[PDB]
Amino acid sequence: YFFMSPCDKFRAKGRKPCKLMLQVVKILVVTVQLILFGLSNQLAVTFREENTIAFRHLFLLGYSDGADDTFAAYTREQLYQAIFHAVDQYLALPDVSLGRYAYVRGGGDPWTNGSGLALCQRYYHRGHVDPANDTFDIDPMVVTDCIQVDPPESSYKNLTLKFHKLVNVTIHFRLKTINLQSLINNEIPDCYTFSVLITFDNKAHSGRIPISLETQAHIQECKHPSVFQHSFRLLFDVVVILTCSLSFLLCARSLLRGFLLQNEFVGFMWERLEFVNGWYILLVTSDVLTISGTIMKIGIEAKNLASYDVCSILLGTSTLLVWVGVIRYLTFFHNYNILIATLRVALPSVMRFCCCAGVIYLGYCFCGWIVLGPYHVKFRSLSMVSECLFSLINGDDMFVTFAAMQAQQGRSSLVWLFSQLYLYSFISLFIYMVLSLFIALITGAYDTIKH
Amino acid sequence: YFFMSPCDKFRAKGRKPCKLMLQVVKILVVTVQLILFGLSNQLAVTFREENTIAFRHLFLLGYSDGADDTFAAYTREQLYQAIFHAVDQYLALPDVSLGRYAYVRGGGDPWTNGSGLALCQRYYHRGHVDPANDTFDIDPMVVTDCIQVDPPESSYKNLTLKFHKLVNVTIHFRLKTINLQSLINNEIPDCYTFSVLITFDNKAHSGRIPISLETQAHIQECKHPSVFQHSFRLLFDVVVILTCSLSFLLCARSLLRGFLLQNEFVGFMWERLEFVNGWYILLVTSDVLTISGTIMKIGIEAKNLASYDVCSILLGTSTLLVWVGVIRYLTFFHNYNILIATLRVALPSVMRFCCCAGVIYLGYCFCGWIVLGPYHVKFRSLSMVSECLFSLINGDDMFVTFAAMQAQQGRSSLVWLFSQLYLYSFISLFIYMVLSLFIALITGAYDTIKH
Amino acid sequence: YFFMSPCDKFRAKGRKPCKLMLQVVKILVVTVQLILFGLSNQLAVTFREENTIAFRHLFLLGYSDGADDTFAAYTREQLYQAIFHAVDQYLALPDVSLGRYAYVRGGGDPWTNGSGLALCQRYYHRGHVDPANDTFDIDPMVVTDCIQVDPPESSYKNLTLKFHKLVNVTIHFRLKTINLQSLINNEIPDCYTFSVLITFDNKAHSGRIPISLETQAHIQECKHPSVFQHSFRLLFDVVVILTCSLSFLLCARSLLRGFLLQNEFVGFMWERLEFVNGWYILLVTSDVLTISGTIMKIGIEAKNLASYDVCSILLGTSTLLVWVGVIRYLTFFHNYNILIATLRVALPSVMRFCCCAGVIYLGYCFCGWIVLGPYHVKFRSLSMVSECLFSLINGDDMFVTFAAMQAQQGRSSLVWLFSQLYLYSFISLFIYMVLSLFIALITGAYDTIKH
Amino acid sequence: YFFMSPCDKFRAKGRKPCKLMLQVVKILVVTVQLILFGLSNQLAVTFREENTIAFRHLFLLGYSDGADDTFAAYTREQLYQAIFHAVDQYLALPDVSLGRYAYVRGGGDPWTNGSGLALCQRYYHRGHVDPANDTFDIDPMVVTDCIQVDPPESSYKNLTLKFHKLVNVTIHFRLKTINLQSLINNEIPDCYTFSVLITFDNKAHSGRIPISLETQAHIQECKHPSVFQHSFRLLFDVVVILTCSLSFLLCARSLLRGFLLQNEFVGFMWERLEFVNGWYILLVTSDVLTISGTIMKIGIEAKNLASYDVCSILLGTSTLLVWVGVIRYLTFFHNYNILIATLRVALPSVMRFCCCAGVIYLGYCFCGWIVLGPYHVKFRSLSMVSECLFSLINGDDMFVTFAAMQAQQGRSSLVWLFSQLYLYSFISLFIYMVLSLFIALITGAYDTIKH
Ligand SMILES: Clc1cccc(Cl)c1C1=NO[C@H]2[C@@H]3CC[C@@H](C3)[C@@H]12
Ligand SMILES: Clc1cccc(Cl)c1C1=NO[C@H]2[C@@H]3CC[C@@H](C3)[C@@H]12
Ligand SMILES: Clc1cccc(Cl)c1C1=NO[C@H]2[C@@H]3CC[C@@H](C3)[C@@H]12
Ligand SMILES: Clc1cccc(Cl)c1C1=NO[C@H]2[C@@H]3CC[C@@H](C3)[C@@H]12
Q: So where does this one cross the membrane (chains A, B, C, D)?
């Protein structure tokens, strides 16, 4: 038909395979670009993580590595000591810190003019809580009292906390640093502004106030730079864009020809989905994703985008798609095409059995959540329950799940017995039946392919 | 026959499928009710857990997060310091605690009138233990000496412990608090009474006295409440009850008609279990469970039931059952019905092989318990042994099991060799044979279904 | 033939199945005896473990739970402080300990008359080690200098350690205690003599001296006991012995009749292994094991055996065997016999493939040991390597194995690359081929059984 | 043909199997040599590890076991204290250490004449970093200022660190010790020179300076040794070499005869790869590896090679190969040859499906790296991503992977959703389809072998 023919068969009675060469070049350039981008991102992420760890060690009183989710205050003296230690360490940073930092001094909403640190309470507008008469009268609206501290170059120790009506206490300040680590990977050093927020959280009003530290980095270009002796990335990005544009044009032209031929055939006869060649759909999709991600990456490197997650997702999805596309060349042979056809034949029944098993799985997920949420730390949220069950049907973390309920045998024996029955039934049903049926489906598809 | 017919076939020669619509509505309402109940329970459980953690940090001397099962006293001075620290922290709570608590002051059996704390010894009536002459004379009956401490608004430091005859020392007090965290999820704040029990356990008489803290919360409604501006749950519960009642009535009427038709057929002829339609049995069971759980949940929200475990189990089992019921609609087609029929055909042989493999499994469980209980921390109880073996046949926690016995190679080499043989034999037998036979059973059932 | 017939078929043309009833009674009594013995052993083991933990906390300076394999001394002052603290805590035990202990005061080889504690050095007879001239002259023979301390009712702080030639330092003492915890499980309290050994080990001469504490309990009966109000076990043991003797006699008589019938058949004809009925061999073996274990258990309870490991192994193996014997009754039917016959048919090919795969497995074990012993903590000994590989082919502890070598990427990259190749090749080969062939063997056997 | 015949068939019409006996002897001697070498290496590795642990405990201020990757300095006072503590502990080692060590006193590049310790800064040649004006001017070239400390038998506390321009601080010294632990395994004690390097790493300039200690041991023979009473290894090594040489000669002669016979056959006829007998190729390869490894091991024991990794890899690969060679004798039968032929038939399709699945796997690896590197500690490098995914398709470490992303749900929900989709899709695709197809391939190959 000279259409739908295989490529080796076009070559026998036609032109050269000049469009299959373009695709492998696209795979090469996309992979190289992704690798380079990932290396640079690794460097930046390591810098930010190390700076945040140093900030925690400098500003959190009595902080040790690994005590992040449990780190909390339990007495009023503890809270006062933590707050004052954080402020004093802010005031002594140029003399005690191993890094080099600069003060920012306002220019924003939380901080007034000439103010570098903001110590602010947040409490209810009116709170009259007494448990002796079992009475209360609360106006929920949150009032903020902010204390401003000028960086060194007074009344922050006069702070009086409204403990019974407190919502949270927060400390806000920024630090300016220069990334000198970026020099090893060529490059010109960047200027980082770390926005540090320390939260003393009392929303639960349970007598336990967790303490956490978070940072938000804003990267700029340092004015007046000099490295005494110091385009490739931009040129490679435009090379990727040009190759992707050519691939998109060729695939679109091929799809248009296919649609025109389908229309001619349907006119002749006076199954339309068999004229589509979804490999080209995949190529076009990865093509658009690559182009969008490359523009976003160029902006990020030009320092005016700072949207790393979307660009990373776009480029990663495009790379995954272009690597999936080698199956197209693997089907051009026979001994690989038999396996690929086996998978293609097996897929629909696999999805249908996934529907049934997943309905049962959702039932088990809801039951496990509602029953073992109060007791099992692995069953707190619905997504956590789903992850636990999914890892449990694959033979992972089973004994810890059983032991976390053994640690309750003293408490409700009804709950312990229900947990035993639930876990045993679910694991047996999904290991001995569902996975075995998946294996049987694949084996049957392979048998039909061979026969 | 116009009975046992499929639904699409009733529609061709009869009425509309107005009872299949009722079931999906039931699934929707049951799932929504369960989700809402689970969210509220999550909030309450988090409040209780945080309060208990704060209590432990406030009252246990030298307590750190993670030291719960190992936390213990080893010297008489340590025991005295822990007890006195607990009592003093009880006396200083209004001045040191980050939360707001109120004293309860008796009104109960452990505490006398106007007493908030109870420090009580429990020792044998007569204990004369000497190991030098290898003699003893004990009257086991336990005597209690209770010390009552009035909350602040004297002789507890004169406590003298009968160490050689001591059974345990316990501290009992209650704290009243108001749940202000419940405001974020709408609601009117609840009043919590925490019953705190601190146990210094000396039942083993081994020179090691574990220390633990447990709480029991009693939730009431706060009299005279006010939130300045602040039925849906009750109405949705009665909606669920009404839908469930209608479903139960319809299923019961259908079952009665089926039984009458079976009786007519057996009269005509002058296999009875093939006239039952167990889908309707499942629907009725989930129906009764949902109604009972909804009444219990209404009582709990009305604050006069406080039986959370039974209601949660009822609602979770009902939700699991109603989600299993979508297989009924999946069998109405063909490509799903083949898989469901494969599972149905495979089930009996699976249960029979479960019987045989489980008999072997029980033999191994008893042997492993009796031999590795003294040495392996994973083999202490029969249920623990069963969980360990079950997770071991699924490829989980194998190397830790081997290493816990490698940590004994220095001690009995006979025991180490037996553990090696036992573990290797059990794992090989249950991985390479039993699971493979389960897979073979499912594959054979699939083959018969296709052929 | 009225021999080899099934039991339901004997009943049709003969007597009643009065020997199958005896076997289920044997299973019942053996299981009950094992459960009771296990409960008592649990109690004793818990007592010993708690006493040892208390001893460690009392006598090891700066000891914390979990620091058992890493607990060590690194300076001469540290060693001196640890030794003196141990001796002083021995001298202050009656005034500081929460338990009740008695001194033993000699009557043995390590301790002289009227001596309760033995502080002894062990050093080379002649040691002249200098690393400056790279010379040494050692006479390896170990000399012991023992210091005897009288229990309270002097020159141990004058100890001078020969550090350069030291082998080890050991402390030996005994404590007498009475097990009062045994009263809860009825019983009359036992008298325990704990032999405590503290070792300061310097055999490696590496500047790191590990410190460990071990105990050896010797349980006796307390003379002149009294519990004011306080045979079943002995009678149940003799009941088990009698039932086992009857079962052994019946099985032996049946085997003798079978051998006589085989001889008659071979005489008639002028395959011998098909006249054995190995079920009866299993019954006789479990019978002998049960009788031996019961005599040993009676001796242990009579307090003059103290050989717990052998008795536990005997009774556990017997219980496992008697529970395996229910397959005999499961084969009497058809739907269970098909599965059991499938396993019987599959077994020989499974063992042969085990031989081949195990030869490859031994090759991999030797290679992994010799290469990753110096670097990987999981590959230190051959048995550890075998356990690691066996758990690795079952999908357990794979990422930790990979990460322990990632923690070396900085050191030898040749070793890291070899570890990558070795692990990937071994896991792929034993997951995708060997286990799949085991599954194929079982599936084929099932197919032949059905066909 | 009297060629390609089986061995039992040669014996019927020819000579005795005198070359199969040589191979089992080779297996025996290779295994014994490897075991002995591994035991000696275990001893040496344990000595080095214990010495390094003692060095860390002696020289790192506030160091605890397990704090190796997190151990770091955060303040200038902390850095100064750590450096001075390390130097002072170097100066007090002969009086405080439990081991026996000797000073080395120069004779090298880092240390001047008569200097044992080198305290050296490394900073940029010109560093003018200010973040207030967002300006810098750096000359990257690294300048070193070395402080030399004479071992005891002054101005190191006058050290002034250029914090803003610092790269790293390093301490270099050597210690001489004699391995007395080697005496237990016979042997004459060795002389060890430990090269100790302590690094205070500030390459990231993030305010966090990690501290690490590494050692490099150089083992010599101690001059003038004496153990008062104290060839087998050398003789056994030459025995292995001789057996290997004979095996290599026989296999080479057989291969030459096979090639000559192939040439004669191709001349007669006027498939060549079927005259090779790759078993002999494997034997020759393991033979060369064994000989090379044995020469290297003899050199190492003679103390003038010190190249342990290459020798260990050579000997381990040779042992693995010689153990793989028992399959040759297992194929000589029939019931084993069927299984081996099944594996041989299945192998090519397995490799082709490995190609396809690995292309998809590489796509997923790149996507997972680029997206979850910034957030997931398990996805930092490409090799780490590959190990994580490979262990994830085998049911290992799944819930920890899910939980490390649950710990981010608060941060980017787009990233969390992408991680959920990515993990679920990858695990489902590679568990329910790829492994099932591998099983189907093996089952089909087994079916063709039987039929
Ligand atoms: Cl329902 C669901 C929720 C969340 C995540 C997943 Cl992977 C699922 C499932 N998709 O289909 C089934 C299949 C059988 C248990 C898994 C695999 C289940
Ligand atoms: Cl016996 C038993 C006790 C406790 C829990 C369970 Cl899941 C069982 C079993 N039920 O049947 C067998 C099947 C083969 C090992 C499991 C699965 C075993
Ligand atoms: Cl060789 C060996 C040594 C130690 C322990 C065991 Cl379980 C073995 C094996 N027995 O046969 C094979 C089978 C394939 C890997 C296991 C299972 C291997
Ligand atoms: Cl691509 C790759 C990179 C690194 C390590 C390995 Cl093991 C591989 C693979 N080799 O082929 C496939 C097969 C399917 C997932 C594994 C097994 C994959």
A: 20-40, 234-256, 276-296, 308-330, 353-373, 417-438
Amino acid at position B364, single letter? Y
d(CA A294, CA A242): 11
Assigned domain for B446 exists: yes
Torsion of CA B147, B148, B151, B154, to 10 degrees: -60
**Tokens linked to B259:** 């039984």
The tokens describing B226, both together, are 């006010």
Pair A83, A188 in one domain: yes
D72 Cβ contact partners less than 8 Å away, ≥ 6 residues apart: D208, D209, D210, D211
Would the CB atoms of C51 and B207 count as touching at under 8 Å?
A: yes
Q: Which atom of ligand 1 is nearest to the CA of A386?
A: 4
Let me know: does A305 contact A220? Beta carbons within 8 Å.
Answer: no
In sequence order, which residues have a C-beta less than 8 Å from that of residue C186 and are 6 or more positions away?
Answer: C230
C49 lies in some domain: no
Residue D341 and residue D313 share a domain: no
Q: How far is the CA of C425 from the centre of ligand 4 (A)?
A: 10
Ligand 3 pocket mutation, candidates B392, B428, B431, criterion most atoms within 8 A of CB? B428
B359 within 8 A of B376, measured Cβ to Cβ:
no
Q: Per the domain annotation, does B51 fall within a domain? A: no
Residue D188 lies in a domain: yes
User: Tokens standing for D363?
Assistant: 């796509």
Could you tell me if D314 and D351 lie in one domain? no
CB contact, 8 Å: B377 with chain C?
Answer: no
Instruction: Spell out the alpha helix ranges (H) of D60-189.
Output: 76-91, 93-96
Q: How many domains does chain D have?
A: 3
HEC per residue, chain A: CCCCCCHHHHHHCCCCCCCHHHHHHHHHHHHHHHHHHHHHHHHHHHHHHHHHHHHHHHHCCCCCCCCCCCCEECEHHHHHHHHHHHHHHHHCHHHHECCCCEECCCCCCCCCCCCCEEEEEEEEEEEEEECCCCEEEEEEEEEEEEEEECCCCCHHHHCCCCHHHEEEEEEEEEEEEEECHHHCCCCCCEEEEEEEEEEEECCCCCCCEEEEEEEEEEEEECCCCCCCCCCHHHHHHHHHHHHHHHHHHHHHHHHHHHHHHHHHHHHHCCCHHHHCCHHHHHHHHHHHHHHHHHHHHHHHHCCCCCCHHHHHHHHHHHHHHHHHCHHHHHCCCCHHHHHHHHHHHHHHHHHHHHHHHHHHHHHHHHHHHHHHCCCCHHHCCHHHHHHHHHHHCCCCCHHHHHHHHHCCCCCCHHHHHHHHHHHHHHHHHHHHHHHHHHHHHHHHHHHHHHC
Which of these three, A332, A351, A380, is where a domain ends?
A332
* Domain span holding position A239: 7-43+234-332
Nearest CA to ligand 3 atom 10: C358
Q: Decide if A445 contacts A346 (C-beta within 8 A).
A: yes
List the structure tokens of C208.
Answer: 């790191």
Method of elucidation: cryo-EM
- Residues C286 and C213 reside in one and the same domain: no
- Domain co-membership, B201 together with B248: no
Helices (H), D100-231: none
For residues D114 and D153, the answer to whether their CB atoms sit within 8 Å is: no
CB pairs under 8 A between C and D: 238
Mutation test of the interface with chain A: which of B95, B216, B220, B320, choosing the one with the most A Cβ atoms within 10 A? B320
Most B-contacting residue of C52, C104, C320, C345 (CB-CB within 10 A), to test interface: C320
Q: Do C129 and D179 touch (CB under 8 A)?
A: no
Q: How many residues does chain D have?
A: 451
- Helix D382-392 vs helix D398-406: angle between axes, to the nearest 10 degrees? 120
Last residue of a domain, one of B305, B332, B359: B332
Distance between CA C289 and CA C315 in Å, rounded? Answer: 7
Are residues B83 and B180 located together in one domain of the fold? yes
The tokens for A382 are 């619905």
